[PDB]
Design a protein around this ligand. Sequence first.
Ligand SMILES: *[B]([O])([O])[C]([C][C]([C])[C])[N]C(=O)[C]([C]C1=[C][C]=[C][C]=[C]1)[N]C(=O)C1=[C]N=[C][C]=N1
Ligand SMILES: *[B]([O])([O])[C]([C][C]([C])[C])[N]C(=O)[C]([C]C1=[C][C]=[C][C]=[C]1)[N]C(=O)C1=[C]N=[C][C]=N1
Ligand SMILES: *[B]([O])([O])[C]([C][C]([C])[C])[N]C(=O)[C]([C]C1=[C][C]=[C][C]=[C]1)[N]C(=O)C1=[C]N=[C][C]=N1
Ligand SMILES: *[B]([O])([O])[C]([C][C]([C])[C])[N]C(=O)[C]([C]C1=[C][C]=[C][C]=[C]1)[N]C(=O)C1=[C]N=[C][C]=N1
Ligand SMILES: *[B]([O])([O])[C]([C][C]([C])[C])[N]C(=O)[C]([C]C1=[C][C]=[C][C]=[C]1)[N]C(=O)C1=[C]N=[C][C]=N1
Ligand SMILES: *[B]([O])([O])[C]([C][C]([C])[C])[N]C(=O)[C]([C]C1=[C][C]=[C][C]=[C]1)[N]C(=O)C1=[C]N=[C][C]=N1
Ligand SMILES: *[B]([O])([O])[C]([C][C]([C])[C])[N]C(=O)[C]([C]C1=[C][C]=[C][C]=[C]1)[N]C(=O)C1=[C]N=[C][C]=N1
Ligand SMILES: *[B]([O])([O])[C]([C][C]([C])[C])[N]C(=O)[C]([C]C1=[C][C]=[C][C]=[C]1)[N]C(=O)C1=[C]N=[C][C]=N1
Ligand SMILES: *[B]([O])([O])[C]([C][C]([C])[C])[N]C(=O)[C]([C]C1=[C][C]=[C][C]=[C]1)[N]C(=O)C1=[C]N=[C][C]=N1
Lengths: 182, 182, 182, 182, 182, 182, 182, 182, 182
Amino acid sequence: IPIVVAYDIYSRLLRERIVCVMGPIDDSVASLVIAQLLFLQSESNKKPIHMYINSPGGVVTAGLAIYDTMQYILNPICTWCVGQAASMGSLLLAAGTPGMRHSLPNSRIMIHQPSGGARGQATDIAIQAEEIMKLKKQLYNIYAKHTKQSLQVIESAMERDRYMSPMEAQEFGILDKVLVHP
Amino acid sequence: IPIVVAYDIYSRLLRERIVCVMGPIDDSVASLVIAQLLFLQSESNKKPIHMYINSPGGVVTAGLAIYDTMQYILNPICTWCVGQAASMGSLLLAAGTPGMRHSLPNSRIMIHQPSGGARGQATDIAIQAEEIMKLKKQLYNIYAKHTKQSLQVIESAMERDRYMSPMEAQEFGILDKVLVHP
Amino acid sequence: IPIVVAYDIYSRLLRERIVCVMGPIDDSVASLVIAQLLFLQSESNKKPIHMYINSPGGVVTAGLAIYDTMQYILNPICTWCVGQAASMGSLLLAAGTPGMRHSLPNSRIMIHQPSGGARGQATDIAIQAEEIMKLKKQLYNIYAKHTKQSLQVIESAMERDRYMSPMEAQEFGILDKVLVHP
Amino acid sequence: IPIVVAYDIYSRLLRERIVCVMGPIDDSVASLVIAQLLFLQSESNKKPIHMYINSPGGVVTAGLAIYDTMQYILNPICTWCVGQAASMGSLLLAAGTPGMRHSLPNSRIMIHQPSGGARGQATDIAIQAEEIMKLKKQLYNIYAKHTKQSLQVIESAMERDRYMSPMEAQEFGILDKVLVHP
Amino acid sequence: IPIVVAYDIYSRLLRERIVCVMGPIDDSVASLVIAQLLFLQSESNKKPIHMYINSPGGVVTAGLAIYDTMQYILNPICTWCVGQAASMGSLLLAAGTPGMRHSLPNSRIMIHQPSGGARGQATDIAIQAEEIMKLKKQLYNIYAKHTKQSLQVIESAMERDRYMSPMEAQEFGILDKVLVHP
Amino acid sequence: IPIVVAYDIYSRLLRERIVCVMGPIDDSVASLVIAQLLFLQSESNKKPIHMYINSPGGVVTAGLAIYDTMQYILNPICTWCVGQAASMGSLLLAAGTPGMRHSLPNSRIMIHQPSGGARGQATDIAIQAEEIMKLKKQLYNIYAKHTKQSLQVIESAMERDRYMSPMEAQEFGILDKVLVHP
Amino acid sequence: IPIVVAYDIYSRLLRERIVCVMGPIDDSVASLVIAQLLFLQSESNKKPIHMYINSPGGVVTAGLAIYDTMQYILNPICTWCVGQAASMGSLLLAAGTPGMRHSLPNSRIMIHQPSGGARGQATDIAIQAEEIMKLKKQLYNIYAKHTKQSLQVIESAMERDRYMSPMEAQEFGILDKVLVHP
Amino acid sequence: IPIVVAYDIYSRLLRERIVCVMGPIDDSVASLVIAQLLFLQSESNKKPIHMYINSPGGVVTAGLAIYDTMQYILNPICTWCVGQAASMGSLLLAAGTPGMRHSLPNSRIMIHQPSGGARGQATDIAIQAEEIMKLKKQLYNIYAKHTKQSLQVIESAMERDRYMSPMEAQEFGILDKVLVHP
Amino acid sequence: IPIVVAYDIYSRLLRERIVCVMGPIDDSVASLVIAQLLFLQSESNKKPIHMYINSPGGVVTAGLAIYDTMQYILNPICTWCVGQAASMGSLLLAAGTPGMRHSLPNSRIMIHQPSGGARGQATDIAIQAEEIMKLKKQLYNIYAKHTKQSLQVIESAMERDRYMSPMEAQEFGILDKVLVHP
Ligand SMILES: *[B]([O])([O])[C]([C][C]([C])[C])[N]C(=O)[C]([C]C1=[C][C]=[C][C]=[C]1)[N]C(=O)C1=[C]N=[C][C]=N1
Ligand SMILES: *[B]([O])([O])[C]([C][C]([C])[C])[N]C(=O)[C]([C]C1=[C][C]=[C][C]=[C]1)[N]C(=O)C1=[C]N=[C][C]=N1
Ligand SMILES: *[B]([O])([O])[C]([C][C]([C])[C])[N]C(=O)[C]([C]C1=[C][C]=[C][C]=[C]1)[N]C(=O)C1=[C]N=[C][C]=N1
Ligand SMILES: *[B]([O])([O])[C]([C][C]([C])[C])[N]C(=O)[C]([C]C1=[C][C]=[C][C]=[C]1)[N]C(=O)C1=[C]N=[C][C]=N1
Ligand SMILES: *[B]([O])([O])[C]([C][C]([C])[C])[N]C(=O)[C]([C]C1=[C][C]=[C][C]=[C]1)[N]C(=O)C1=[C]N=[C][C]=N1
Ligand SMILES: *[B]([O])([O])[C]([C][C]([C])[C])[N]C(=O)[C]([C]C1=[C][C]=[C][C]=[C]1)[N]C(=O)C1=[C]N=[C][C]=N1
Ligand SMILES: *[B]([O])([O])[C]([C][C]([C])[C])[N]C(=O)[C]([C]C1=[C][C]=[C][C]=[C]1)[N]C(=O)C1=[C]N=[C][C]=N1
Ligand SMILES: *[B]([O])([O])[C]([C][C]([C])[C])[N]C(=O)[C]([C]C1=[C][C]=[C][C]=[C]1)[N]C(=O)C1=[C]N=[C][C]=N1
Ligand SMILES: *[B]([O])([O])[C]([C][C]([C])[C])[N]C(=O)[C]([C]C1=[C][C]=[C][C]=[C]1)[N]C(=O)C1=[C]N=[C][C]=N1
């Protein structure tokens, strides 16, 4: 990591209210992002915060924690898609404030349904299957809230993997603008 | 394996209409047992067949195949518990013809509910959980048929592992007689 | 393997025109089954042959070779489901001559669509995807031929895993009779 | 870890009397949390301390040490559920001072009974089983103290895995308030 | 294995009503021994059978199956200690008919209590501990039956490992005669 | 391997002048096939020999040895495709005598160019590349000789993997007849 | 890494508006490069930025993110080929502003088509193959935009691996100048 | 590890004359603890030192070194049980100055006899067994000195593992006070 | 193993009352040797038996079982040292009947004391050390009985490894004759 005499490049970016969400999303990544967001709200609760996303997905609880923290703080949040947005990435991209969700021209967006596993006795397996079913329902409700589509459309579009270009995702309601130059 | 000039000990026993079910029950064991039963029925459909059981359990499909083959052939079948009859083994012991199920004085019998696993997408997990639920119902129905207990008693007694001595298993309905000498 | 003074149990069964198809289906299993079928046709081309099936599935080419050999020889063929007929196994069970397909009362039958993989350059991936798609079409045509269902019903019923009891499979057209006793 | 010219993000948060309990709970995590709590009490024994929880569980002794340290110091303690609270997490969340336990709207809470193992001679196994039973009784007593439920309800609700949404956990007595915005 | 033109050495010995129990005792060993005993009873139910023991112990269920089979058949049984008799071996040596238990002059005999393990939830651990305790009681009862000692003496002598020479074991009641020459 | 009292199934088939070429082709397979062909020619040099092929391919030298031995002996040779013929298999299938090459209705045939590797110093790499190029030329010449196609068509058709149904392969010149029944 | 009293050599180079893209291109490399580009634009949006490339290639999404960020910022960008430029390297080298793409005299440039893989059910395989085909189309469009060649020439030249010297790549349109001295 | 601008949390605690003994006890842990104790004595030989214990045990020589260093220095020492004090840990807890040994209300204390191993020739094994026996005698003497119990009680109570709550350990003589609040 | 038309070489040798004890001595070797000795005694109780030894040693219980069986049967026994007689082997060589122990001119004989190990709690270690001490005493008594040396000489000579030529071993009392030709 290069240094700027004495910062590092990511701390220098954080001085400009910029947070990076890169790679797969797990508990360490989620805790780091949440700490940065809380610190930025502590500095000022009226200035916008910019989040750059390049992720293939990750764990449901970590992404839901990030989403809930984003909805909690009072600052307006802008989301920028650079590269990839799959699973929670595409859920985070759509979670920015209306009118402030952007993508670069050569990005890919992917949506699909959650996956998991069960093990043990039959009673245990029943309990775990019920848990994952209601988790799927909750995720679909969040998607329907932020894309302004209907529940039937969301259920139809997420049975299998679905890929989109920025124009297709803008038509779907995941994005607002596709930008070429500042 | 010792030989009897030229048989082996198991073929010499099979000459006396004796089949041995020892160790874990899998597809190879099931196919061997079924082939032996078909051969013995081909030799004669009126003479009794003796089955010695010492097993800790195994796969559901193999044991159900053995049970179905046992119910299909016309010969009367005697079952003998030597050492252990746990899980699928305890299902086979109770499947002999009425009045012909025996145990040795120092044997242990164990009953419990089936186990498994699920993996994949949410739809896949739902399908697999439904399959294992109806498997459990079918097994409970077989147990209730052969022990003359009610369905509620069977469901209560198999929530956890249950261990029994030969007298307790005779009172439950899994056995008819506990023998010390010929 | 027990011996009958000097045969083995499977050769003694083959003396009664009985062939066993047990376990996963691969090239060795297919070659053994085909050799036995050719030998039995060599002995006599007018007597029936009985095939017992307990399999979870296997490779497409081996199962298609077995199916083609079954359709080639002139002998009538009876199929017996003991325990499990899943994936390729369920294709063989339905391939017996009409009026001669049987199952035991506690068996499970499963149907679903084929799976595979692709690797390499984009042109190679396109070629392999085309190959697997036409493989799926051929398998669906065989199923529609032998179950007397329509192609739309077969396509709808095989998108996901589908499990069946002997009565359900008899209603579908995979079986003719469910037998309890000889 | 990003730095603030010179702190790290977690030390900058600790300057605001904020402690993070993230990931599995073991001895290192417990010692770090306890050291931070003692330092914060040293700075001031009248100001509130905030604890953010996102954990799947861990070891009983470490969590009990954290709980005892929380009950020892004189400062009021607020607990915040972000993401997940299972095993000790759900025990720690309920251990905050009354009126100061919060959750985010999309969190999951899980409760169940403890697990372990025994090995060795029969006398050793008896001793270890007695120890784990006493551990279970002590944990149930703590839960009953802090949720205001009866012991029978606690024992009934923890035989199997139990999952809860924030409203359900608020009704159970684990939480006081579910918050959307500051 | 050397051959006697065509037998092997163990089948040649079995022609003289001699059964060898060597090495650790598991399910395969138990099934082989039981098959040989049943065959020898089939040949004649009035002639003595000789059993040579050199074993360090093994599994409880297999040894109890062997013991029950020995007590079931009508033939008198002689036991010969060559080298070692520990755990189940020392249980089998004492199980011969009175007046027919022998040892070689330089053998070692060892007695101790059983061992095991438990795993899982607290209820499971309680069930497993209860099972192993009643197993210990059953083994102690068998020892007291065949050695003519009191239960308190047996419990006192088996808390730790106890080693014995043939004269000490003869005084204890495990043996009848120590022989130097035929 | 089943036995016919005393042959094995493959020796029983060899008594009917049937040779099986199954699985991958390597030096052991080639040696066995060549030995069988020489023995069958020794028995009689005027009777036809039947070869059943189910292979995914293999090594060039072994397949070329089999091809040369097939062209050497004086007996007419029939080839039968059951299941699969890829790489050398498709080369072997086309090598039968004209009018005697058959396939089953559901078989797949595949053709492509050879593959290899080079290593070492630059001079060594040049030598090895020259060797593989002339190997390719020789294989193409054999294909052109036996299919009656032009060299340009063969080079065009084998740049990438090419798959074929029995009717397409009959049109190409690899086969003579597609048979459903004897 | 040597230090310049307190910088490191790469931070000292970054003080001169120099960014290094060395080794394989993955998500970490892409995020670091993008952060450096954003910081350099923050310092000044009118001064040129120099990018040195020595890479064998990498992942498509990371390289496309770097390319999109390069086209977004307003600064003129010079590209310098030192050593190797294969896959995305050659795509990045051609993406500099016209008249500002340079190479050293002994460098190698390579172009080819993308590669990947597919797995799962047939529907999944179809979806993934469609995705990789449209990815190839997008890459070809970018190449045709920046080299001023026609689409047919680009598709012809990328079927196999193609190697070029700096003069050949200058004639192709990937470069403007080959320099020996400043 | 969090920092306090510039200390770490453990150095900040050491500024308050607090030493932490956490985790298993080995030579590195012992050397660190002894160095801290010597430094604290060098700062002042009249002020109390506080030691917090959460350990499952460890090596005998390291713990005896810590014990001897504690008895050597002139400062009064307070011991605090948080979570766990087992094996060597329970020896250190009892080693504090009279009237200054505390525990938290939910801690567990465990006592038992030492363990080891021997290997080699018979003379070596005799020497090593003698060494471990006198080690046991020395440990028992230390326990009897600090708990004010008799040697017979100590030997009777340590044959097997013995578990204690803080009240039971206070009755035994290991502790002075159980505290809920400061 | 070569065959003599149909024996093997070892069975052909056993036809001449020759037993081979080669390689390390363990339970399988001991059981085979004992079975052969019992068979040879069954054939005739007055003819001599010849035993050829080439062994580096082994387990104490197996060798003591062989020694006890050797002293039990009534036949005279000749021992022949070919190559090596070390540890247990040297104990068997000296165990032949007086006047019938021979060696080849270039053999090596080695004597030393037994080795072992102990593990566990201190009481267990004491018990195991006592057991190995009495084992050593019993072995020394056997050596003193068969060599006609005093116990002090045996104790002095086996503290360390001791090597001997046939003449030295004859002087020590392990052998009677060193032979060059029949
Ligand atoms: B995506 O592939 O990242 C996708 C999320 C999308 C549907 C919003 N991920 C998941 O569904 C993950 C996959 C996963 C499983 C196991 C470990 C890590 C990631 N699912 C879960 O995290 C999960 C957790 N609990 C239950 C069910 N699924
Ligand atoms: B027992 O252990 O024999 C028991 C059967 C009893 C309830 C009559 N066996 C099972 O429940 C087995 C356990 C197992 C799982 C996986 C591999 C091998 C054995 N269950 C199954 O075989 C099974 C199969 N399909 C679905 C669910 N469970
Ligand atoms: B089933 O599991 O028996 C099923 C066949 C059913 C649809 C009639 N099998 C397959 O789909 C197999 C799975 C498999 C993959 C790889 C190795 C072994 C088995 N598919 C294939 O064999 C296959 C072969 N070539 C291309 C695609 N799929
Ligand atoms: B949860 O799953 O984290 C749960 C705690 C809940 C009941 C308050 N955990 C446990 O019960 C743990 C599981 C575990 C076992 C072994 C290592 C780590 C974690 N149990 C224990 O820590 C434990 C310790 N001693 C005895 C029994 N159980
Ligand atoms: B001995 O050590 O062989 C002894 C037998 C003696 C007490 C009559 N053996 C056991 O106690 C065995 C040890 C063992 C454990 C696990 C695998 C193999 C052997 N115990 C058991 O077999 C056993 C089985 N179920 C429960 C408890 N113990
Ligand atoms: B096919 O895939 O089986 C194919 C043959 C076809 C062109 C008639 N096989 C080959 O080309 C084989 C692949 C292979 C490589 C290495 C080990 C085993 C198989 N090629 C060769 O055998 C080979 C040998 N020497 C040089 C070049 N290629
Ligand atoms: B080159 O070899 O680096 C080349 C890129 C060129 C065509 C612009 N690379 C790829 O095509 C990579 C290869 C790769 C595969 C897997 C992991 C890492 C690298 N392809 C991809 O990244 C890719 C991604 N998704 C779909 C298809 N291909
Ligand atoms: B306890 O677990 O802390 C306990 C000490 C207690 C009796 C005061 N420890 C031991 O007994 C240790 C166990 C151990 C063995 C090997 C490595 C690490 C730990 N014993 C010894 O350290 C030991 C050392 N030398 C001889 C014998 N035992
Ligand atoms: B020698 O190597 O043959 C020798 C015996 C000699 C003194 C007459 N052997 C032993 O001392 C063996 C070594 C050994 C140890 C462990 C496994 C195998 C071999 N000793 C024992 O067998 C043994 C057994 N129980 C206790 C002590 N030693």
